[model samples]
Target: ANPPPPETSNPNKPKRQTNQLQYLLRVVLKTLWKHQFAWPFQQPVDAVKLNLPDYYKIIKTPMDMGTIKKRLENNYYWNAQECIQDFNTMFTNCYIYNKPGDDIVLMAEALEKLFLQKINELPTEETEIMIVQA
Candidate 1:
């Protein structure tokens, strides 16, 4: 699992937590999801990968809101289904929320409730700012 190469001999380095990676991922995706709903249209973050053997690059999608809207609709749905389901699967097997702090439950539940509460509310992304805090 590439366990950070055993005890780095640095005193100033921050101690790593076991759940750090997953925690950071959930936060980043949540932020991205918010960013996706910006203004009269969503933000563009699509890209092209190099035909390289194992890795790649690219970003900056089109400005056409209509076509981009369709793509965005498909993409956000796909991401919500796949990402949330995967997270739920992991949560089920791992009992992720039983512990205190460093939990996905808190964030997921918050987002779920936010969506439920706003199910009929008019769009606010155009007027409000989505802020991310470290």
Candidate 2:
């Protein structure tokens, strides 16, 4: 059997709320974090093998949930660039079908493009020129 880490309060549950959707654009932001950021490393150790990091970060000690959490935290902190490569691999790996959907899903990536496309259409006459007077 594997040993549990000391810091984790529970083995069966995560320390943080899975999705309170903490920010504006809650649906989009939370989904991106879980699906795009977290899920890449959520597989059984490096079994996903999505990118270069997938070749490293191999779980060896049979550590518990807290250890997994800590490793994920440190990995993201020091090697965020690895995540970009993972995204590239992710885009190439996604092969699911549209199966069909009644509604559209919104993505921030597209919204950014739309904002750039429409930015010149907005009036800036009311632009303020004030300084922090504290």
Candidate 3:
């Protein structure tokens, strides 16, 4: 006998949860980049130089959505998407808006735009976005 067909999701089911997950990932990545907490940043590079194992320890543990939400709530940072969006807006206003004269500023603007766009395009279904309010 043939194996039973795989169950498919209801076509009409709401996708808000999935969308939120994508939003969460974008927020985490943006936060890391904005704070220079990730690769290519001197902080992470120096940490690695001191001890690769220590650096791995810092980055290896994946943060759960619940923990992220709790931290944001504690800090009054708003929801994950909101926090990320606000930061992006602030960064744009500071470095991109009304300043096309500096080449460095232009580069920053381009990179920011590219990063945001890339984050937006990623598949969010595989992610989980759960916010816990205080």
Per-structure clash totals for the candidates? 0, 0, 0
Could you give me the TM-score of model 2 versus the true structure?
Answer: 0.22
* Per-residue lDDT of model 2, residues 11-95, tens digit only: 5543222111111113322334443334432333333342323222333322222233443333321232222233333322221
TM-score of model number 1:
0.22
What's the lDDT for residue 56 in model 1? 14
Task: Please identify model 2 stretches exceeding 4 Å from their true place.
Answer: 1-31, 34-71, 76-78, 95-134
lDDT of 3 by residue, 30-134 (tens): 554553222322111233343434333433322222333433433333334544554354345434223576653554455456556756665544444444441
Error of 2 at 67 (Å): 13
Positional deviation of 42 in candidate 1, in angstroms?
13
Q: What is the C-alpha lDDT of each candidate?
A: 0.31, 0.29, 0.40
lDDT of 1 at 91: 30
What stretches of model 1 exceed 4 Å from their correct place? 1-32, 35-102, 122-134
Clashing pairs in 3: none
lDDT tens digits, residues 1-134, model 1? 11121121334543232222232234433343463233222322122231222111111112312332332223322232333443333233222323434343444445445433432233333222222342
Candidate achieving the largest TM-score? 3
Candidate order by lDDT, decreasing, is 3, 1, 2
